[PDB]
Amino acid sequence: VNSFSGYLKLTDNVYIKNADIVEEAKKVKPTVVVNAANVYLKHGGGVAGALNKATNNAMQVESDDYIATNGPLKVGGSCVLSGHNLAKHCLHVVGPNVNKGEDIQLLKSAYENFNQHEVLLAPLLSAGIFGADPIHSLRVCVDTVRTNVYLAVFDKNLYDKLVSSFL
Numbered sequence: 001v002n003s004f005s006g007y008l009k010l011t012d013n014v015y016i017k018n019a020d021i022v023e024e025a026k027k028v029k030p031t032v033v034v035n036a037a038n039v040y041l042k043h044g045g046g047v048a049g050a051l052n053k054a055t056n057n058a059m060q061v062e063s064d065d066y067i068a069t070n071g072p073l074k075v076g077g078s079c080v081l082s083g084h085n086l087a088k089h090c091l092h093v094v095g096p097n098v099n100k101g102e103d104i105q106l107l108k109s110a111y112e113n114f115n116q117h118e119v120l121l122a123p124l125l126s127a128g129i130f131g132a133d134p135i136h137s138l139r140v141c142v143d144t145v146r147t148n149v150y151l152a153v154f155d156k157n158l159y160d161k162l163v164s165s166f167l
């Protein structure tokens, strides 16, 4: 049994809700929240900008030190950093950004990072300002992630479309 409330069950391991990921993290304090990161961990906008704002910029300060030591992530890659006031840990995952011309096949590699964590609160990778089709992102999630994932969808309209169209 866990804390997550109000989710629709899509599969054995994937659950979805129309919710503010920031507000959901604040309520649940999950072990892992996933950030929709870029390779520079520059949390300007989208999910990343919202998560970082909710940490009062402490996520960005920590991320800048991580990059200064380790250099950029790979597209499809991840790192584990603090969850600050939102979660125990934040898994920063880089999905491909279609608005930069990145290979959408890297979306599966991105979701494979979730399998290193038994339970996660996450957004749909490469959705929103990363330019991918969220329906496709949900399909790759279901077909890749084997651990228990609780997906938060920002738009109510999009949430309803993802549920109605789910095979």
Ligand SMILES: O=c1[nH]c2cc(Cl)ccc2o1
Pocket: 020, 021, 022, 045, 046, 047, 050, 127, 128, 129, 154
């Ligand atoms: O809380 C949130 N969720 C979000 C989802 C997208 Cl795509 C963008 C900004 C967001 O801020």
